[PDB]
Design a protein around this ligand. Structure first.
Ligand code: SF4
Ligand code: SF4
Ligand code: SF4
Ligand code: SF4
Ligand code: SF4
Ligand code: FES
Lengths: 102, 127, 127, 756, 120, 166, 196
C-alpha cells in the first residue's frame, strides 16, 4: 500500500500488476487526520502541517518557512547599521527567497 | 531439468503444425496471447525462442474450435495443454526424452494432431 | 457584464466594440485576450474581456489571423486599448472546447476564471 | 422499521433491505462483484461476506450480505480481523486466473476487481516481514481472447471472473438470453449460439462487467479511463432522453456511457443511443457556405450574413418559414415562438411535429407506470421509446420503486429475485406486426396500419372489436389505475388520438405519448406549431424558409430563398439551398429539453470539435437582423430568464402543459415508414450495417412483387431515395411494404415506388 | 505518473503481420513536452515494460517552443543525437558528436549506444 | 547602424557580437543557482566572451531569464528588458521559464515569451550548465545567421527586432 | 513540565483536547477566550511563536464547526534560561462571514508576517495588527487564494497536432470527496493505516 511492488515480478503476479497500476495512477489513501513533524535544516526549523482527508491527494499542506520567519528580524538586525553593511548583514542572515516567498 | 528447452522447441513445432493446418484447410489461426515475462521484462533477459503463449483455430464465425496453450517460463508443473471448446475435451502433453512429444504415454504425432483438428473443425465449426 | 460582438466576425466585433467603448478611461482597466495554443499565433483566435473594475465587457472569439481581417482587427483593437491608456494586458490560455462555453458561464465565474488564468503580456505581440 | 447495528453505528432500515445495503447505509464498505443494482442478488462472488449476531449470539459462518435479509435488532460486523482476512482470501481466489493485462487492459483505472483488490486484499498478518503477493504458482486459465461478439462488443473470456451479471441481466432486464456459460468447473466460459447479439440493449453488459471481459468495440483502444473528459448530458435521439456521459478527449468523441438518474433511466442506455455516436465526431460541416456561381463556396460569417441581408431585404414577414429540429432546445423553441409572434408568420413548425400534439395527453411518470395496474399499448416501445421496454420489464414482474438509502439506489434489492416469472395478464399490446413484447402480451393482436382508430373505437365501446380487442377493453375497464401508451400511428392520426384522449379521460388514466421528435412536447409547450395557413415542416407553403433539418425535396422545390442550418452537408442543399451554416450537435449543445414525461433535462456542451459552428439561438438572432426584428434571446442566461418567465420549472421538474387543437392531414397509404430505434444519420463506422434500411414484405406479396429475401432494393419516397435490404416476414400484413423510417419521420404512410 | 502532465500516449492495437510491441497494445503516439517535462523519471518508474527510460543526451537547447515537444521517433534507441544536433549535422554534413562520456550505459538502456569510458 | 548594409561588415559585427555576448542574469529560482554553476572552476561561461558580468541592464545584450517568473515579477523583468540597449537577445532557462513547468497555477507565467521576446529556449530542471553553453552557442550561431528550425527556416539574428514595442 | 499544566488548565475550563496517537497535541479555545488565553500562555513562559496556519475546511469530507480554522504554534526554547521544551498548538475556528481574530503581534513579533500571510491567502482579518498588507499575492490580485472557493488556475499542456491535456480531467488520483472511478471507494481507498 505504501511501496510499489518490485519491478522484476511485474511479469508474474496479478497482484503485482494491479498494485503497480493502481499505485502509479491513483496512489494510496492515508487516514483522515492532521500531522506535523519538526526538523533542523541549514536555515533553521522546518516542518509540514498536513491535513489528509483519506484521499489519494492531500487535503492541504502548509509549510513552516524558516527563511520566512527569520525575515521579520531584518529591519531590527540592520537597524542603525551601515549602507554597505546592509548588504553584508543580509548575506550573513542566509536568506533563500524560494523558501521565503514559496 | 533441461527438458524445458526442447519443450519450448516442440511448442514452436506444434505452433508450426497449427499454422500449416490453417493455411491448408483455409481456416483462421490466431495468436491469442504473448508472454507476460517478455512484455513486462524491461531490462531482464529473455532466452525463450518465441514470445507466444496462447494460440487458437477459429471457424469462419471467429468462435474457436481448438485451443492450445503452454505454461509460462516461471510456473511450476510445466505442461502443454489442448482444449476443444464446447466439447469438454482437454489434453495434457509432456515431452519424454528420445521418444518425443507424448500425451501421457501415447506419442503425439503431427498426424494425430491433424486428425484431431479435422474432427474438431467438422464437428464444432459453425461456419 | 456586457457581451458584444459575435464569434468569427472580426470587423463586426471590432466596430461594435468601437461604438460600445466610448470615452471610457482604461487607465485602471485590465484587458484579457483569451486564446488557445500559446506558441502558434499565426492560426490563433482571440476573444476579449475588459475588466474595468466597475463593470466588465465581453467580446467572443472573433479576432486574430484565424479569421480574414482578424489579425488586423486584433492589432487595431490592442492599439486602441493602448491609446485609451490601457496598460495591463493579459493573455489567457483556455482549451478549444472551453473557449465556447467559457463565454456562456455566469459573469462572476467567467471573470474569476479569466483573472486566475491570465498571464501578463506585452501588447506589442498583438500589434 | 428494522433496527440494525453496523460495527459501531445504529441504523433504521426498511424491512425488505439487504444486509449489504444496511451496511452501506451505515456508511461502511464490503467487496461487491456478483450483485448489481436492479439485478437479482445471488451469492456468487461470495465477496459481501459479513458477520451477523441476532440475540451475544454470533452466527457460526459468515453471512452473504447481498442475499441475507435483515431482521429487527440485528448486528453486522464488517471490521473483524477474520472478516477482512476472508475478504482478502476471496480476492485472491478471484485473481487466481486473471490474465495480467492491467496496463494493456481497456478497463484501466476503473476496474472493480482492481479497486476492491487494493481496498480489502493483503490483510496485515502478524517486524518487516517480507510478504508474498501470490501463493498460486501454477498455470493460469488460458482461453479465447479478444473475440468480437458483435460489431459493438468484444469478449475476453480470461478476464471474466464468472460472476452472473451479464447473463442475469440478459435474462431479467431486456429478456434476451443471448449470453450464457458453456462448460462448468473452472472451464466455465461465456458464449452464445445467438451470435449477432440480437438485443437492442446489449451494450450495457459492457458497463456492468466488473472486469475487462466485455468491452466496447466502438471505443476500443482510444484512451484510459481517467484520461477521458466526461461531459454529463442527455441524449436527444428520442424523447425519453436518457442521461448519458459523453467521453471526449483532444476534441474527439470516444465513447458514450450511461448516466444514472433513477427517475427516468436507471443505469441503462440503448445500443443505438450508446454506439450511434460515430457520426457526430467523424465527418461534419465546419464553414458557412454561400451560393455564388450556381454552386456553393466557403465564406466568412460576414459574407454569409451579407448574402442573408440581401436575400431577405425583399421578404414579407408572412411568407417566412421557421422550421426547427426534433431535438431543438426549449430556448430555441421559445425564441422561434417569440420571433414569429413579433414577425407575423402563420407557419412555423419543428421536424417531428405530429398531427395531434402530445400536449393533448397528461404525461405519466415511470414510477407511476411501476405502480399502475394495467398497461394498454399501441405502437412498438422497443423502437419508438427504447427504455420503456426496460421499465415494462420491471412493471411485468410486479417490481415497484425501491426505498432510497444513504448510498442511493439499493445495491441488493431483495425485491428482485432470480428468474422471476413475468405476468402476461398485466398488459395488452396492439402493433401492426408481431412485436417482440407480444410474448408478454396475452391480449395481443397484430393489426394493419390505419386500424388503431378502430381498436380505440372498440375500446371506447361504440362498436365491437375482435376477441383480443374486447379482452383489452375489458381489462382496461377492470383496471383501477391503468396507463395508456401511444406511438406514431396514434399520434399522427387525429381521430385515433382523440379517441385515446376520450378513453383516458373517461377513465382516470395517464398517457405516455411516443413522439417521433425528441423535444416535441417542450417545443409545443414553447408554442412551436403552425398557424391557420399552416405550411408545416413537410409542407411547401412558404416562400422563404429556414430549416434546421433536411426536408422533403418537394418542400425545397419552388422556394425563393432557403437557409439551412445543418451539422453535416446534404446533397439536397447543394442543389436547392442558397446559404448553409454549421450547427453543433446535441452532444456539444447546452440548453433544456422536455422529456415525454414532462420533465426538463439539461444539455451540457461536450468539448468536441465544432469548428466555427453557432447555436440556432444565435443563428435566429442574426437572421432577425436581416428582417429588422430585434430578437429577445441571444445567450443562454437571457434565454433562461425568459424561460423561467415562461414558467418552465427547474431541471428534473415536471412541466405541466396541455393543448386542445388538431391539425389533420390525409395519408397516402401504399408504403409504411417503419419506426426504428436506429436513426439514419447514425449509419457510420460500425453502426453502418446496424442502421441499414429495411423493406419488410409478406412472402406472398414479396413473391408477387419480386422481392427476394436478401435483396438490396432501392426505394423512392418524397423523403428521398434510399436502398434497403428486403426482409420477408409472415407477420407483416399482405399488401404492405414496411420501409425503415430511420429518421424522426416514423409512423408516416407515403406513396412511392421500388426503383430497379 | 507525470506531475507536470508532459506525456501524451495514444495507443493502438498491434498488427500480427508486422508487430510493434509484445502485447496487443503499443504506442501509436508518444509525445513528451520537454518544456513541460520536469525530468523526474516517474514515467520510467511507472513503465512496466521498460520502454521509457531516461537517457544521457543533454544538448537539447533549441529555438522554438513547438520544436521542443519530442516525439517517439526522436527518442528511439536507434537515434544518435538531439534534435538541434541532428539538424546541424544534416545542414552541415558533419556527423554528430555528443558532448558526454560515461563509464557505461545502464542495462535498462539496452540498445542505447554511447561512448563508454574509452571502450572505443 | 544595427550592423547591416555591407556583406563583410555585417558578418564581422555579428562575429564580434556573437563572441562578445554579454550575459545579464535575471535570477528567479534554482535555475539561477544552476546558472551560477556555469561560472565555477569546472565549467565556466568565461571563455567564449562572457567573463565580465555587469549587473546593470544598460550594459548587456543577452538577457538570461533563469527561474520561475512569478506574475508579480513580470513587469519588473519587462522594464529591465526595455531598459536594455537595443541589440539585445533573450534566453529562457529551464522549464518554469520556457513553459509553466510542473507549477501550472495562478502564480507563474506559463511562457516568458508572453512578456519578453525570447530568442532561445533551454529545457531541463535544472538545465545542465553544459546545456546552457549549448544554448549560448546556439544563440551565437543564431546571430551568425547559422540557425534553422525544424521547418527549414533560417532564424533572424535578433528577436525583439520583430515587435511593435510601443 | 509546562505542558501538563496547560492540559490540566484547559480540561478544567471545558476546552476540548484533540490527540492523535502519533504525538501531536491541540488545545482549541473559543473566539472570546482566544486572545486572553494565549496572553496567559505567553505569560506561562512560551518564548517562541512558531506558526500561524490558516485552514479552509470547505471541501473536507467531514463537516467542521466553521469554514476557516487558524492554528497557532507556541514553544519554549529548551536551551534558554529555564527551558522545558513544551510545544503545542492552539486551534481557533473562524466563521465564513466573520473573518476576525485578534493578533498576537503585540505578544510575539513573529506573528506579524504570519498573520499578514493568513490574511493574504484567506480573507481572515487580524485585529490589532500593526500593518495588514498583502504580502505574497500580486498587488493587483483579487481575492484570497488558499480558501477552496478560489481556483488553482491551471493552463493546458500542449503537443503537436491539436493534442492537449487538461490536468483536472487527466488526474487519476482521487480526493476525499471524489467518489472514484468505480461505483465507490472502500477499504484502503477510503482511508488506510498500518499497525506499525
Ligand atoms: S480486468 Fe482489471 S485487474 Fe484484470 S487486467 Fe483489466 S484492469 Fe487489470
Ligand atoms: S463476462 Fe463479466 S459480467 Fe459476465 S460473468 Fe464474466 S465477469 Fe461477470
Ligand atoms: S435513443 Fe432514447 S432510449 Fe436510447 S439513449 Fe437516447 S434517449 Fe435513451
Ligand atoms: S520525467 Fe516523466 S513523469 Fe517526470 S515530468 Fe518528465 S515525463 Fe513527466
Ligand atoms: S525549471 Fe526546475 S530548476 Fe528551474 S526554476 Fe523551475 S523548479 Fe527550479
Ligand atoms: S456474493 Fe457477490 S456480493 Fe454478495
Amino acid at each position: 500500500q505504501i511501496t510499489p511492488p518490485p519491478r522484476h515480478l511485474l511479469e508474474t503476479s496479478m497482484e503485482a500488476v494491479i498494485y503497480h497500476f493502481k499505485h502509479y495512477t491513483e496512489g494510496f489513501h492515508p487516514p483522515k487526520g492532521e500531522v506535523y513533524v519538526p526538523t533542523e535544516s541549514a536555515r533553521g526549523e522546518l516542518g509540514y502541517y498536513i491535513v489528509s482527508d483519506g484521499g489519494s491527494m492531500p487535503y492541504r499542506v502548509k509549510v513552516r518557512a524558516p527563511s520566512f520567519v527569520n525575515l521579520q528580524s531584518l529591519p531590527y538586525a540592520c537597524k542603525g547599521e551601515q549602507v554597505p553593511d546592509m548588504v553584508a548583514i543580509i548575506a550573513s542572515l542566509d536568506p533563500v527567497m524560494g523558501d521565503v516567498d514559496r | 531439468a533441461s527438458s524445458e528447452r526442447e519443450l519450448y522447441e516442440a511448442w514452436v513445432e506444434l505452433l508450426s503444425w497449427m499454422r500449416e493446418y490453417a493455411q491448408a484447410k483455409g481456416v483462421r489461426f490466431e495468436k491469442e496471447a504473448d508472454f507476460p515475462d517478455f512484455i513486462y521484462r524491461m531490462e531482464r533477459p529473455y532466452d525463450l525462442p518465441t514470445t507466444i503463449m496462447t494460440a487458437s483455430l477459429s471457424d469462419g464465425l471467429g468462435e474457436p474450435f481448438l485451443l492450445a496453450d503452454v505454461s509460462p517460463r516461471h510456473a511450476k508443473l510445466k505442461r502443454i495443454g489442448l482444449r476443444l471448446p464446447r466439447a469438454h475435451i482437454h489434453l495434457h502433453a509432456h515431452y519424454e526424452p528420445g521418444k518425443g512429444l507424448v500425451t501421457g504415454k501415447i506419442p503425439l504425432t503431427k498426424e494425430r494432431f491433424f486428425a484431431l483438428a479435422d474432427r474438431a473443425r467438422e464437428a464444432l465449426a459453425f461456419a | 457584464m456586457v457581451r458584444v460582438g459575435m464569434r468569427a466576425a472580426p470587423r463586426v466585433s471590432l466596430e461594435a466594440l468601437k461604438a460600445a467603448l466610448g470615452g471610457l478611461k482604461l487607465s485602471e482597466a485590465k484587458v484579457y485576450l483569451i486564446t488557445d495554443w500559446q506558441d502558434k499565433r499565426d492560426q490563433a483566435r482571440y476573444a476579449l474581456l475588459l475588466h474595468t473594475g466597475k463593470k466588465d465587457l465581453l467580446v467572443p472569439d472573433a479576432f486574430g489571423p484565424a479569421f480574414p481581417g482578424g489579425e488586423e482587427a486584433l492589432s487595431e483593437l490592442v492599439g486602441l486599448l493602448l491609446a485609451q491608456g490601457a496598460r495591463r494586458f493579459y493573455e489567457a490560455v483556455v482549451s478549444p472546447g472551453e473557449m465556447t462555453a467559457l463565454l456562456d458561464l455566469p459573469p462572476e465565474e467567467l471573470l474569476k476564471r479569466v483573472m486566475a488564468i491570465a498571464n501578463p503580456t506585452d501588447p506589442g505581440i498583438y500589434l | 422499521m428494522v433496527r440494525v447495528k453496523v460495527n459501531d453505528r445504529i441504523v433504521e432500515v426498511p424491512p425488505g433491505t439487504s444486509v449489504m445495503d444496511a451496511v452501506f447505509h451505515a456508511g461502511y464498505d464490503v467487496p461487491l462483484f456478483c450483485s448489481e443494482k436492479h439485478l437479482s442478488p445471488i451469492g456468487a462472488c461470495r465477496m459481501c461476506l459479513v458477520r451477523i449476531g441476532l440475540p451475544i449470539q454470533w452466527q457460526p459462518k459468515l453471512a452473504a450480505s447481498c442475499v441475507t435479509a435483515v431482521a429487527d435488532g440485528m448486528v453486522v460486523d464488517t471490521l473483524s480481523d477474520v472478516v477482512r482476512e476472508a475478504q482478502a482470501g476471496m480476492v485472491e481466489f478471484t485473481l487466481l486466473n486473471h490474465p495480467l493485462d492491467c496496463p494493456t487492459c481497456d478497463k484501466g483505472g476503473a476496474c472493480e476487481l482492481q479497486d476492491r483488490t487494493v481496498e480489502y486484499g493483503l490483510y496485515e498478518k502478524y517486524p518487516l516481514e517480507l510478504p508474498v503477493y501470490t501463493r498460486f504458482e501454477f498455470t493460469r486459465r488460458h482461453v479465447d481472447k479478444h473475440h468480437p461478439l458483435s460489431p459493438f462488443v468484444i469478449l475476453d473470456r480470461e478476464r471474466c471472473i464468472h460472476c452472473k451479471r451479464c447473463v442475469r441481466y440478459f435474462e431479467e432486464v431486456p429478456g434476451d438470453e443471448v449470453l450464457d456459460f458453456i462448460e462448468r468447473g473452472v472451464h466455465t466460459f461465456i458464449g452464445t449460439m445467438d451470435f449477432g447479439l440480437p438485443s437492442g440493449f446489449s451494450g450495457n453488459i459492457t458497463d456492468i462487467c466488473p472486469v475487462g471481459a466485455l468491452l466496447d468495440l466502438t471505443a476500443r483502444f482510444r484512451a484510459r479511463n481517467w484520461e477521458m473528459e466526461e461531459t454529463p448530458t442527455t441524449c436527444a435521439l428520442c424523447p425519453v432522453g436518457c442521461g448519458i456521459t459523453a467521453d471526449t478527449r483532444s476534441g474527439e468523441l470516444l465513447r458514450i456511457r450511461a448516466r444514472e438518474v433513477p427517475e427516468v433511466n436507471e443505469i441503462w442506455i440503448c445500443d443505438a443511443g450508446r454506439f450511434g455516436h460515430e457520426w457526430a465526431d467523424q465527418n461534419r460541416l465546419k464553414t458557412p457556405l454561400v451560393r455564388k456561381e450556381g454552386r456553393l463556396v466557403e465564406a466568412t460569417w460576414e459574407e454569409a450574413f451579407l448574402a442573408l441581408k440581401e436575400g431577405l431585404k425583399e421578404a414579407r414577414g408572412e411568407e417566412v418559414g421557421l422550421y426547427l429540429a426534433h431535438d431543438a432546445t426549449l430556448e430555441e423553441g421559445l425564441l422561434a415562438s417569440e420571433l414569429a409572434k413579433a414577425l407575423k408568420t402563420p407557419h412555423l413548425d419543428f421536424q417531428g411535429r405530429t398531427a395531434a400534439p402530445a400536449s393533448l395527453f397528461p404525461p405519466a411518470s415511470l414510477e407511476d407506470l411501476l405502480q399502475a395496474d394495467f398497461a394498454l399499448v399501441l405502437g412498438d416501445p422497443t423502437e419508438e421509446a427504447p427504455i420503456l421496454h426496460l421499465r415494462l420489464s420491471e412493471f411485468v414482474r410486479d417490481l415497484k420503486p425501491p426505498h432510497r438509502y444513504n448510498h442511493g439506489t439499493p445495491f441488493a434489492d431483495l425485491q428482485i429475485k432470480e428468474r422471476m416469472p413475468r405476468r402476461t395478464d398485466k398488459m395488452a399490446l396492439f402493433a401492426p406486426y408481431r412485436a417482440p413484447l407480444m410474448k408478454w402480451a396475452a391480449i395481443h393482436e397484430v393489426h394493419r396500419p390505419g386500424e388503431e382508430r378502430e381498436i380505440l373505437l372498440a375500446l371506447l365501446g361504440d362498436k365491437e372489436g375482435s376477441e383480443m380487442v374486447a379482452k383489452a377493453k375489458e381489462a382496461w375497464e377492470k383496471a383501477k389505475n391503468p396507463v395508456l401508451i401511444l406511438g406514431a400511428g396514434v399520434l399522427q392520426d387525429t381521430v385515433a388520438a382523440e379517441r385515446a384522449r376520450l378513453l383516458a379521460e373517461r377513465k382516470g388514466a395517464k398517457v405516455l405519448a411516443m413522439t417521433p421528435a425528441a423535444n416535441a412536447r417542450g417545443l409545443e409547450a414553447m408554442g412551436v406549431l403552425p398557424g391557420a395557413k399552416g405550411a408545416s415542416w413537410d409542407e411547401p407553403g412558404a416562400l422563404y424558409a429556414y430549416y434546421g433539418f433536411v426536408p422533403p425535396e418537394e418542400a425545397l422545390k419552388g422556394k425563393r430563398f432557403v437557409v439551412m442550418h445543418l451539422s453535416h452537408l446534404h446533397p439536397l442543399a447543394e442543389r436547392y439551398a442558397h446559404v448553409v451554416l454549421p450547427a453543433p450537435t446535441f452532444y456539444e449543445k447546452r440548453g433544456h429539453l422536455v422529456n415525454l414525461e414532462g420533465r426538463v433535462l439539461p444539455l451540457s456542451p461536450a468539448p468536441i470539435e465544432n469548428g466555427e459552428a453557432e447555436g440556432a439561438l444565435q443563428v435566429l438572432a442574426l437572421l432577425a437582423e436581416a428582417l429588422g426584428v430585434r430578437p429577445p434571446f441571444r445567450l443562454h442566461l437571457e434565454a433562461q430568464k425568459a424561460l423561467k418567465a415562461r414558467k418552465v420549472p427547474e431541471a428534473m421538474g415536471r412541466l405541466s402543459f396541455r393543448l386542445k387543437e388538431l391539425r389533420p392531414k390525409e395519408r397516402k397509404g401504399a408504403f409504411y415508414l417503419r419506426p426504428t430505434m436506429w436513426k439514419a444519420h447514425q449509419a457510420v463506422g460500425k453502426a453502418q450495417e446496424a442502421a441499414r434500411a429495411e423493406l419488410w414484405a409478406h412472402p406472398e406479396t414479396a413473391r408477387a412483387e419480386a422481392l427476394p429475401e436478401g435483396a438490396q432494393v432501392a426505394v423512392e419516397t418524397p423523403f428521398g431515395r434510399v436502398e434497403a435490404r428486403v426482409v420477408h416476414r409472415e407477420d407483416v400484413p399482405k399488401g404492405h411494404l414496411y420501409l425503415s423510417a430511420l429518421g424522426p419521420a416514423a409512423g408516416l404512410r407515403v406513396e412511392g415506388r421500388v426503383l430497379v | 505518473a507525470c506531475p507536470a502532465y508532459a506525456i501524451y500516449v495514444e495507443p493502438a492495437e498491434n498488427d500480427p503481420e508486422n508487430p510493434v510491441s509484445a502485447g496487443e497494445r503499443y504506442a501509436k503516439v508518444y509525445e513528451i513536452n520537454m518544456l513541460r517535462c520536469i525530468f523526474c523519471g516517474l514515467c520510467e518508474e511507472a513503465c512496466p515494460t521498460g520502454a521509457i527510460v531516461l537517457g544521457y543526451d543533454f544538448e537539447m537547447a533549441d529555438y522554438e517552443y513547438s520544436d521542443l515537444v519530442y516525439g517517439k521517433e526522436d527518442m528511439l534507441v536507434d537515434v544518435v543525437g538531439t534534435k538541434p544536433q541532428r539538424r546541424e549535422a544534416k545542414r552541415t554534413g558533419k556527423p554528430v558528436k555528443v558532448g558526454y562520456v560515461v563509464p557505461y550505459v545502464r542495462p535498462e538502456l539496452e540498445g542505447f549506444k554511447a561512448p563508454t569510458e574509452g571502450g572505443k | 547602424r544595427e550592423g547591416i548594409l555591407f556583406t563583410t561588415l555585417e558578418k564581422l559585427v555579428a562575429w564580434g557580437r556573437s563572441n562578445s555576448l554579454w550575459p545579464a542574469t535575471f535570477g528567479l529560482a534554482c535555475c539561477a543557482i544552476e546558472m551560477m554553476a556555469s561560472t565555477d572552476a569546472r565549467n565556466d561561461l568565461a571563455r567564449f566572451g562572457s567573463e565580465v558580468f555587469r549587473a546593470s541592464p544598460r550594459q548587456a545584450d543577452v538577457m538570461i531569464v533563469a527561474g520561475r517568473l512569478s506574475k508579480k515579477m513580470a513587469p519588473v523583468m519587462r522594464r529591465v528588458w526595455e531598459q536594455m540597449p537595443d541589440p539585445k537577445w533573450v534566453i529562457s532557462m529551464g522549464a518554469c521559464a520556457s513553459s509553466g513547468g510542473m507549477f501550472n497555477n495562478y502564480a507563474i507565467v506559463q511562457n516568458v515569451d508572453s512578456v519578453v521576446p525570447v530568442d532561445v529556449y533551454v529545457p531541463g530542471c535544472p538545465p545542465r550548465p553544459e546545456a546552457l553553453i549549448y544554448a549560448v552557442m546556439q544563440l551565437q550561431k543564431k546571430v551568425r545567421g547559422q540557425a534553422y528550425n525544424e521547418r527549414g527556416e533560417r532564424l533572424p539574428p535578433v528577436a525583439a527586432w520583430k515587435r511593435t514595442r510601443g | 513540565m509546562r505542558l501538563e499544566r496547560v492540559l490540566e488548565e484547559a480540561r478544567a475550563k471545558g476546552y476540548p483536547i484533540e490527540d492523535n496517537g502519533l504525538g501531536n497535541l491541540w488545545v482549541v479555545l473559543p473566539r472570546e477566550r482566544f486572545k486572553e488565553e494565549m496572553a496567559h500562555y505567553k505569560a506561562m513562559g512560551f518564548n517562541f511563536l512558531a506558526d500561524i496556519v490558516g485552514l479552509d475546511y470547505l471541501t473536507y469530507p467531514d463537516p467542521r464547526p466553521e469554514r476557516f480554522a487558524v492554528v497557532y504554534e507556541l514553544v519554549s526554547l529548551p536551551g534558554w534560561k529555564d527551558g522545558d521544551g513544551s510545544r503545542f498548538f492552539v486551534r481557533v475556528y473562524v466563521p465564513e462571514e466573520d473573518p476576525r481574530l485578534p493578533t498576537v503581534t503585540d505578544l510575539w513579533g513573529s506573528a506579524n508576517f504570519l498573520e499578514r500571510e493568513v490574511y493574504d491567502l484567506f480573507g481572515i482579518v487580524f485585529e490589532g495588527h500593526p500593518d495588514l498588507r498583502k504580502i505574497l499575492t500580486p498587488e493587483d490580485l483579487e481575492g484570497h487564494p488558499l480558501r477552496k472557493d478560489y481556483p488553482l488556475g491551471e493552463t493546458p499542456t500542449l503537443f503537436r497536432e491539436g493534442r492537449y491535456i487538461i490536468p483536472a480531467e487527466f488526474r487519476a488520483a482521487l480526493t476525499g470527496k471524489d467518489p472514484g472511478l468505480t461505483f465507490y471507494k472502500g477499504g484502503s481507498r477510503k482511508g488506510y493505516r498500518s499497525l506499525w
